[PDB]
Amino acid sequence: LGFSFEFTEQQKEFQATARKFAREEIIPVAAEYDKTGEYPVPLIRRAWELGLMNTHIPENCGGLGLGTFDACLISEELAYGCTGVQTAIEGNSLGQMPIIIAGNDQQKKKYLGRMTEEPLMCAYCVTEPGAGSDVAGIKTKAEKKGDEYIINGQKMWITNGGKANWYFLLARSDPDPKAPANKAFTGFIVEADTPGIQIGRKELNMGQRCSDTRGIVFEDVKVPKENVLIGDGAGFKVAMGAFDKERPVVAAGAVGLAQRALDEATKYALERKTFGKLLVEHQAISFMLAEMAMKVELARMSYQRAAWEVDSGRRNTYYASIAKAFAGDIANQLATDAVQILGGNGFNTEYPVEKLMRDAKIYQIYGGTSQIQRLIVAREHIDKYKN
Amino acid sequence: LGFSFEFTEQQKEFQATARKFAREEIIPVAAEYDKTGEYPVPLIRRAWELGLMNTHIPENCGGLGLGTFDACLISEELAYGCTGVQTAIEGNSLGQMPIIIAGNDQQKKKYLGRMTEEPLMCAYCVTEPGAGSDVAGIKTKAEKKGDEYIINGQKMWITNGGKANWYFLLARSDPDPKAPANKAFTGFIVEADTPGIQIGRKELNMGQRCSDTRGIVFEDVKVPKENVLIGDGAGFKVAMGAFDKERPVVAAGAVGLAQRALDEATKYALERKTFGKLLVEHQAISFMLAEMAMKVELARMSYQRAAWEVDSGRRNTYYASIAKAFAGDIANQLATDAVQILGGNGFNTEYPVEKLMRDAKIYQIYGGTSQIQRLIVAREHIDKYKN
Amino acid sequence: LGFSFEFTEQQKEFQATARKFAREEIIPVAAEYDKTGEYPVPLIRRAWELGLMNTHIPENCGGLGLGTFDACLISEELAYGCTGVQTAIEGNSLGQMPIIIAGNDQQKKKYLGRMTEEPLMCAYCVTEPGAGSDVAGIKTKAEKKGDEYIINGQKMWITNGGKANWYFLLARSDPDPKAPANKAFTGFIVEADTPGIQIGRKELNMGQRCSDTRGIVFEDVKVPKENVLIGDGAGFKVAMGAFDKERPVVAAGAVGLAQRALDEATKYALERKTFGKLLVEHQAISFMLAEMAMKVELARMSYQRAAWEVDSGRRNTYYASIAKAFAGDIANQLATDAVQILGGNGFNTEYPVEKLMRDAKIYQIYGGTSQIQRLIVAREHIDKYKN
Amino acid sequence: LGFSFEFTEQQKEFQATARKFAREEIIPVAAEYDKTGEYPVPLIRRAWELGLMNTHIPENCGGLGLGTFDACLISEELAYGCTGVQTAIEGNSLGQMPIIIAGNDQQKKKYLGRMTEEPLMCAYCVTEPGAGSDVAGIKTKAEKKGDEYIINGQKMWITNGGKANWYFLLARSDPDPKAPANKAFTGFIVEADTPGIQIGRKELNMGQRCSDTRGIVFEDVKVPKENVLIGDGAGFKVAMGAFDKERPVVAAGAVGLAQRALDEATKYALERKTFGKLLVEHQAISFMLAEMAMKVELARMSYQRAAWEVDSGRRNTYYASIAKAFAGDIANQLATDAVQILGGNGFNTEYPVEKLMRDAKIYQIYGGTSQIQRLIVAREHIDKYKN
Ligand SMILES: CCCCCCCC(=O)SCCNC(=O)CCNC(=O)[C@H](O)C(C)(C)COP(=O)(O)OP(=O)(O)OC[C@H]1O[C@@H](n2cnc3c(N)ncnc32)[C@H](O)[C@@H]1OP(=O)(O)O
Ligand SMILES: CCCCCCCC(=O)SCCNC(=O)CCNC(=O)[C@H](O)C(C)(C)COP(=O)(O)OP(=O)(O)OC[C@H]1O[C@@H](n2cnc3c(N)ncnc32)[C@H](O)[C@@H]1OP(=O)(O)O
Ligand SMILES: CCCCCCCC(=O)SCCNC(=O)CCNC(=O)[C@H](O)C(C)(C)COP(=O)(O)OP(=O)(O)OC[C@H]1O[C@@H](n2cnc3c(N)ncnc32)[C@H](O)[C@@H]1OP(=O)(O)O
Ligand SMILES: CCCCCCCC(=O)SCCNC(=O)CCNC(=O)[C@H](O)C(C)(C)COP(=O)(O)OP(=O)(O)OC[C@H]1O[C@@H](n2cnc3c(N)ncnc32)[C@H](O)[C@@H]1OP(=O)(O)O
Ligand SMILES: Cc1cc2nc3c(=O)[nH]c(=O)nc-3n(C[C@H](O)[C@H](O)[C@H](O)COP(=O)(O)OP(=O)(O)OC[C@H]3O[C@@H](n4cnc5c(N)ncnc54)[C@H](O)[C@@H]3O)c2cc1C
Ligand SMILES: Cc1cc2nc3c(=O)[nH]c(=O)nc-3n(C[C@H](O)[C@H](O)[C@H](O)COP(=O)(O)OP(=O)(O)OC[C@H]3O[C@@H](n4cnc5c(N)ncnc54)[C@H](O)[C@@H]3O)c2cc1C
Ligand SMILES: Cc1cc2nc3c(=O)[nH]c(=O)nc-3n(C[C@H](O)[C@H](O)[C@H](O)COP(=O)(O)OP(=O)(O)OC[C@H]3O[C@@H](n4cnc5c(N)ncnc54)[C@H](O)[C@@H]3O)c2cc1C
Ligand SMILES: Cc1cc2nc3c(=O)[nH]c(=O)nc-3n(C[C@H](O)[C@H](O)[C@H](O)COP(=O)(O)OP(=O)(O)OC[C@H]3O[C@@H](n4cnc5c(N)ncnc54)[C@H](O)[C@@H]3O)c2cc1C
């Protein structure tokens, strides 16, 4: 009772670990990995050791059993170093989410347990080239055959896609088009090393070059019915819950990038003199940093509220979509203003800012696009007044 | 311990009392009071007996001894009903702030305890015809003369100016112009019943038309030495403090005016159907309302932080400024969007929304413009990076 | 044959005329008319003799035969003085347009001509209680008694509809709701004197109070057969044609208000001083003015474009709505920005700005709200790629 | 004359040619040049022979002798295909603009003519490591050696510094710090290979990758007094005049990128289906497209006017800075939204929109950043007031 914006000593220490790891271990090689686009294997092994990686995996699976407010708290620190790296680590949590909320005891121990005693990666396969935002459209067929299922399809833009040990899979189990979204799909947990899973090439994208984003083909994949999460048909709902829980940490990724641009821009404004006055002395510039500070702040508090809402055990769809919407948006506003203050240098590859601009954009695309976030928020807002 | 976004039981009770009051007692009559420009004496008196008024006066002074966080939540409600009345009531606490934060026990029993016994009002006198944002530019002087300070000068735009029992007055006490702000000004406690004071006529502003705004000339007003707050020079430092601890409460009322606009708009949106579809079914409007909720949802969190901060004995300046800047601005975007989705009806005096737009305006002018707020945030921010 | 951003010697003349009247005879009284709300009859009587008022009526019908471009530059200057009066004098051109563009020679001389004889008013009756934007949602009836129509209905937000000799009416003729817009509506030139025409009371609005606005219940108003403009059920286009034709003027009307806002605020900026600096010194303010300039410039060039399109015979719809949208939008931004720069004064009635803020609000709703503008621009734009 | 937006047959001609060349030779390779960064010699040469490259060289000297308008008309076309190409093709005009204004006929014959007979290039050197926007801040020392001038210092970000036949240069001739900008600098022409010029490495930037951007060093270069443009003292005013004529052209190209982003997103919105309907059916995607068209049509007019003003003999400064600022601004807004409509796809390199976003950022930095562009508008604006 009574509002409180105070972290608990443990949370404070996690923050200390992540922050140091980002500043002294990530930022130097962030640009190296940006250019080469090479997978951050060294970094993820470290992140794993420092215990900043499968932070949700329950304690009884050898995990830290940390909450969501904690994940966001960390992700914002890792993001300040490099979103391309943070996304990679975050992939595991997004993929582990379905098994964490909805898996049974035997499933939790078999798949979350491995991730704890071995730095393995996993991916969350839902998006199809045919449709990403409208989840209820996916065509990946899952034909029930005996005591197993035959998956059939193709996925697109999957994080850690070609580096996962196993995947979360959402497929259409009910062959009837008329079937309602709430009982038409099924969520499975399919091991990567399965005959029939053709993994596609790495896509070259504009902003998180070191992440493993790939398309993936499932032609006649067999999946044991034991590897069916809740039941046949409760896939959609399981997927929904996963997003609801994970969107705050994604917002936290935005504020991370936002912070970095706020820091970069300021340090420079404080060093560069232009019409004899320092850059920071020109009201225009000072006002920019003011608003850049105003935005990153509000974004910090939005994800916090969202995570706290979930951990308090309240459906957070409303506050999560608000958080993602705003943070991903402003993360893109701050990034550009940074390269703007840095002038001609900001457009150049040697300065950090340019990369921050390229990275920013996906925060308005993956994890639900900004338009979908609005759509959800209006869906939640009106339902309060409706009747 | 950790983060919390939960009000206490006492806060919930207060919030309720406040809400039911604005909802049922203010909202109705506010329409008439706005048109007649008549002071809302009745609504004020009921507020005073309900205890929604001098919620800062110390418990050992007949007061409640509530914090800035408490005043805030109450104010968002009163405002929701009507900002003209809220501002009329909030002015009281602003005037009493310098005494609360810097008056000795005797000045407190006297001027504070007095407001416990009868629904008296008071005002904060600082702004002048040619000096508002630039505090250290006031010219109203107060030269010592034995055991009195004889004060000459006029003040402008003083809220509750013509309906107050006593005043907080900030005047220059150092002749030498070069004398620094942190020792040149002195805050005196003037009784309205004092001879020398010339009270101007009620100014007609477009906004919170039932609130009492007017100018006050001070010809040869003597002030018994004992009414100085800390002493000569303490003025700037004491006014500055009040401003800080009090800004979050005004931003509260901006979010209040915002929440109202949002409500009215969503209710009307679920009413008017245009191309066979209700307004809530047209995506332009849908995204509009979602965005609308967002700006409110965030502004509320900004003042809450600013309030929590100061209550915890922390320097709130930075946040008090961020809150006020963001709250005031968004209220203006929500006012006009509310008028916008009510279309033609919104422009008509029979509909509440047009009033909301006229009112929202002062929120970027008084209590520190959006402009000076940007300046403060910038100053507060850059200092973090100066070495 | 090559671009030309220059007026004809002929046009420059009108500009200077309407400029004088606005900034000489209109401006001073506009202030009082707003506080009192009474119809600016004198000013209309003055504009009429001075020319500038029924500048569309064909030469052969008594009028100057001028055209929308001229109409724009003339009204832009007028609106500078008071949109209230502008909307009053424009109510005529709106009402005349459909009688012009689609009226048989007989009705042309019959109706438009008397306007040449005396300063008479006319209204444009489209909107009604349940619908405005949804034009095809008109429920106003009109039955044919062979050689005489019988109109039953009720219009609502009619400008100049309380001082009109006659009104253009658009009524649903085919009870069958499957009736395609293009064919389901008929346009009548009805006279106020006709029985059954029961005029509503004046509406109090937030802004152009000076202008007369009201509803009209058409009890059993019968209208002689020869009053149909084109032909029973071709009325839907005439209104749209009048629109397109006339939207540049309301835009220009907006631009006039935007200019008044910019003229007013800049003057203040070069007089007011805050930290021992004229307001203009502060880079934040100068950048603000530079943007208010940019907006007026583009809206000016945007309406000058639409006005030209239709004057070159080319259909303007696309460029017109682009203009109405943009101009309207920036009008408000400029009004609220001008207020801001005047500080307390801005929010005060002894000052011009406040009025301008309350006036600019209608420019986003009436004569095609900002939304439907974006709606038709997307329509026109898309079809250029559509097949 | 009289307002006209209709083209000349010849410009309609240039337009068609630039349209064919651009969309039929540039766009199908532009990407490959973005991946390799190879200076597009095949493109430059073909542009040289199509007669859409050194358009401003007068007839007598060999060139087409075209004005600023036709320049923009051709530049805005090429930009649609690729800004990187366009920029190199444009660097030439920038490098020779001063001479055209400012050069005695002897200089013209020898320096613009040497161009008109072979596909040669030329650079415009002004930006330095420590000065870019503050042009009066350049510290390169040009000393008067009795019969010639010696050059000492270094320039930076010189568009096409490694590929220029000759360079225009702006150096500080008056050592006396007190020396006002109006008489401090002088402009020279320098054959690329005068001894002492150490051209640096090609800079790697985020967006006009193929455009040959570098920094040069002028350790001890001899330059004959007959290569001085006007004469000792006149430099700043010459560099300015060049900028003033070129800025509309920089504005035009930004619009080109915008139109390329608009056409690209409009085509995908008409082929991507999401909730059982193509993106165009969603009001959010439809309204986005309208707002993108609006910024384009306007941005187009802003330069079309600014180019006219200058071609009409009257200073275009105020209009150039407006066109440039608004153009560079909306060019960036469209690029991003262009990405947004494509969703995940847009963020991938197999698509155009992504490269468009990387190219747009520079349009708010080179040729006069967005904020200095504002400064100028405010300068000229308040000027026509305070007199
Ligand atoms: C963190 C790691 C680093 C980052 C890794 C990369 C992350 C990624 O990109 S993954 C992103 C993948 N794709 C997306 O996120 C796109 C987002 N898509 C959506 O949000 C949905 O498609 C959305 C909201 C449009 C819904 O589709 P739609 O079919 O219209 O919804 P609806 O009919 O309401 O849903 C179906 C049923 O589930 C329920 N449901 C929907 N949303 C929710 C919710 N939030 N909570 C609970 N139940 C829900 C519905 O209420 C309904 O149940 P019923 O009607 O029986 O009560
Ligand atoms: C709706 C609620 C009911 C009431 C409705 C009506 C409310 C109102 O409208 S009354 C408000 C009228 N006026 C304002 O709000 C004033 C806005 N102006 C300001 O905040 C200030 O003038 C400001 C900070 C922007 C500019 O300060 P400036 O004039 O440069 O003085 P500055 O140089 O900061 O003075 C510095 C000194 O004061 C003190 N000081 C300065 N800022 C602060 C601060 N934020 N916190 C504490 N002390 C401070 C220190 O001693 C400091 O340093 P030093 O000792 O070195 O002098
Ligand atoms: C300052 C003082 C002066 C101002 C005073 C105030 C004056 C006003 O307020 S003016 C009235 C304001 N109201 C409006 O502007 C209402 C706007 N709404 C509309 O225009 C319509 O509802 C609209 C066009 C958006 C959508 O119309 P909808 O009902 O969907 O019909 P739509 O499909 O567009 O058109 C149907 C047919 O009519 C034709 N039509 C409609 N609009 C047009 C047009 N602009 N040009 C040509 N033909 C048109 C269509 O081509 C189609 O023709 P066909 O049948 O041959 O194919
Ligand atoms: C086309 C190919 C693609 C693009 C390739 C890349 C192109 C580039 O980036 S080139 C580099 C671009 N750099 C710029 O745009 C920066 C421009 N800004 C400036 O130079 C300054 O900041 C400026 C002019 C705005 C203001 O300050 P400052 O530098 O002190 O000069 P200022 O005081 O305004 O004026 C000095 C003198 O010049 C005169 N002057 C100013 N503007 C002009 C003008 N537009 N025309 C002529 N004379 C002028 C002034 O009147 C004054 O003269 P006087 O002796 O009568 O006082
Ligand atoms: C690098 C990268 C990594 C990703 N990683 C993952 C991952 O780990 N797992 C995963 O499952 N997915 C992942 N994705 C895919 C991502 O989830 C989708 O991009 C996103 O949900 C959008 O779907 P889409 O790409 O199909 O866009 P589209 O669905 O084509 O949408 C296109 C545009 O239309 C708008 N829009 C769509 N529907 C509507 C509507 N009805 N109303 C209004 N506007 C609408 C969208 O907002 C957008 O502006 C990733 C994508 C990228 C690029
Ligand atoms: C691809 C490319 C090509 C170029 N080609 C050329 C070329 O051919 N020739 C040439 O001469 N130059 C060229 N330049 C350089 C260009 O002119 C500069 O980078 C640009 O003017 C920004 O200058 P800067 O980097 O020195 O900005 P800085 O002066 O370092 O500081 C700039 C930042 O602070 C802002 N700022 C500065 N002063 C103020 C103020 N008083 N008020 C408000 N905001 C202010 C700027 O707007 C921006 O936000 C090019 C640059 C690039 C990247
Ligand atoms: C209805 C109402 C009620 C009020 N109630 C009270 C009350 O109870 N007590 C009291 O003492 N006062 C009160 N005031 C006055 C109010 O506090 C001031 O109006 C406010 O502080 C702004 O000051 P100003 O009007 O002098 O604007 P100015 O200081 O004149 O400034 C004018 C413009 O310049 C901008 N500006 C100034 N300096 C800068 C800069 N450095 N950079 C950028 N922009 C700048 C300002 O924001 C504004 O836009 C009230 C005013 C009103 C209208
Ligand atoms: C002073 C005044 C004078 C006027 N004079 C005239 C006159 O002479 N003649 C005349 O015919 N009318 C006149 N009007 C009315 C004016 O034309 C209407 O207000 C306008 O058409 C908007 O219609 P509405 O108010 O009925 O809004 P509605 O049709 O109720 O629309 C309400 C809200 O929803 C939005 N909306 C509606 N449909 C959609 C959609 N499909 N997609 C997205 N958003 C949508 C609208 O933008 C608005 O925000 C006047 C109004 C005023 C206040």
What are the angstrom distances between the C-alpha of B49 and each of B17, B21, B40, B84?
Answer: 12, 12, 15, 19
What are the angstrom distances between the C-alpha of C172 and each of C137, C184, C217, C220?
Answer: 9, 6, 15, 15
H/E run at residue A219: strand A213-224
- Of the candidates B101, B123, B21, B1, the residue with the CA atom closest to the CA atom of residue B57: B101
| C-alpha span between C254 and C257 (Å, rounded) | 5
- Find chain A residues with C-beta within 8 A of C281's C-beta: none
| C-alpha span between D311 and D320 (Å, rounded) | 12
**Reported resolution in A?**
2.6
CA C231 to ligand 3 centroid distance, Å? 18
- Indicate which of A178, A206, A372 best probes the interface with D, i.e. most D CBs within 10 Å of its own CB: A206
H/E run at residue B202: strand B197-202
Across the interface, do B287 and D282 touch by the CB < 8 Å criterion? no
Q: Which two tokens stand for residue B364?
A: 């970027």
By C-alpha distance, the chain C residue nearest D279 is C382
Other chains touching B, judged by 3 or more CB pairs under 8 Å: A, C, D
By C-alpha distance, the chain D residue nearest A359 is D347
- Find chain B residues with C-beta within 8 A of A286's C-beta: 374-375, 378, 382
Please identify, by atom number, the ligand 5 atom nearest to the C-alpha of residue D272: 30
Binding site membership of C132 for ligand 3 (Cβ less than 6 Å): yes
Specify the CATH number for A243-383; select among 3.40.1130.10, 1.20.140.10, 1.20.120.850, 3.10.20.90: 1.20.140.10
Angle between helices A283-311 and D370-383 (to 10 degrees): 130
Q: How far is A336 from chain C (nearest CA, A)?
A: 19
Q: How far is B79 from chain A (nearest CA, A)?
A: 21
Positions of CATH 1.20.140.10 in chain A: 243-383
Across the interface, do C6 and D2 touch by the CB < 8 Å criterion? yes
By C-alpha distance, the chain D residue nearest C386 is D270
Across the interface, do C304 and D280 touch by the CB < 8 Å criterion? no
**Burial D14-39, CB ≥16 within 10 A → b, else e:** bbeebeebbeebbeebbeebbeebeb
- First-residue to last-residue Cα distance in chain C: 31
3-state helix, strand, coil in chain A (%, to 5): 55, 15, 25
Across the interface, do C291 and D9 touch by the CB < 8 Å criterion? no
- Indicate which of B278, B283, B285, B288 best probes the interface with D, i.e. most D CBs within 10 Å of its own CB: B283
| C-alpha span between D271 and D287 (Å, rounded) | 17
Any B CB within 8 A of A230 CB: no
Beta bridge partners, A123, equal: A167
- Find where tokens 């012009």 sit: C100
Positions of CATH 1.10.540.10 in chain C: 3-121
Across the interface, do D3 and C5 touch by the CB < 8 Å criterion? yes
Q: Find all residues with CB under 8 Å of C333, minimum gap 6, and list them.
A: C292, C295
CATH classification code of D122-242: 2.40.110.10
Q: How far is B293 from chain D (nearest CA, A)?
A: 17
Any A CB within 8 A of B286 CB: yes
- Find chain A residues with C-beta within 8 A of D157's C-beta: 344
AA identity, residue D49: E
Positions of CATH 2.40.110.10 in chain A: 122-242
- Find chain C residues with C-beta within 8 A of D6's C-beta: 1-3, 312
- Indicate which of A281, A283, A286 best probes the interface with C, i.e. most C CBs within 10 Å of its own CB: A283
| C-alpha span between D148 and D158 (Å, rounded) | 24
Judged by DSSP in three states, B338 sits in helix
Judged by DSSP in three states, A196 sits in coil
- Residues at CB less than 6 angstroms from ligand 6: A 272, 274-275, 279, 282, 284-285, 340-341, 343-345, 347; C 283; D 124-127, 132-133, 157-159, 205, 208, 213, 362, 365-366, 369, 371-372
By C-alpha distance, the chain B residue nearest C158 is B344
**Burial D298-320, CB ≥16 within 10 A → b, else e:** bbbbbbbbbbbbbbbeeebbbbb
Q: How far is B311 from chain D (nearest CA, A)?
A: 40
- Give the fold, CATH level 3, of C3-121: Butyryl-Coa Dehydrogenase, subunit A; domain 1 (1.10.540)
| C-alpha span between A223 and A246 (Å, rounded) | 26
Q: How far is B166 from chain A (nearest CA, A)?
A: 34
User: Which sign does the torsion angle of CA A318, A319, A323, A324 carry?
Assistant: negative
- Of the candidates B264, B260, B257, the residue with the CA atom closest to the CA atom of residue B332: B257
- Of the candidates A287, A366, A378, A284, the residue with the CA atom closest to the CA atom of residue A331: A366
**Burial B70-105, CB ≥16 within 10 A → b, else e:** bbbbbbbbbbbbbbbbbbbbbbbbbbbbbbbebbee
Any C CB within 8 A of D258 CB: no
Alpha helices (H) in chain B, listed in sequence order: 9-21, 27-36, 41-50, 68-81, 83-102, 105-107, 113-117, 181-184, 234-269, 283-311, 317-341, 343-347, 353-360, 370-385
- Of the candidates A270, A277, A350, A266, the residue with the CA atom closest to the CA atom of residue D156: A350
Q: Find all residues with CB under 8 Å of A87, minimum gap 6, and list them.
A: A159, A208, A211, A253
Q: How far is B78 from chain C (nearest CA, A)?
A: 22
Any A CB within 8 A of C287 CB: yes
CA D288, chain centre distance (Å):
28
Across the interface, do D284 and B282 touch by the CB < 8 Å criterion? no
AA identity, residue C102: A
Q: Nearest residue CA, atom 7 of ligand 8?
A: C158
- Find chain A residues with C-beta within 8 A of B324's C-beta: none
Any C CB within 8 A of A347 CB: no
Residues 82-111 of A with CB under 8 A from D: none
Phi-psi region of B23 (alpha: psi -120 to 50; beta: other; left: phi over 0): alpha
Q: Within 10 A of D265 (CB to CB), how many other CB atoms are there? A: 28
Across the interface, do A297 and B322 touch by the CB < 8 Å criterion? yes
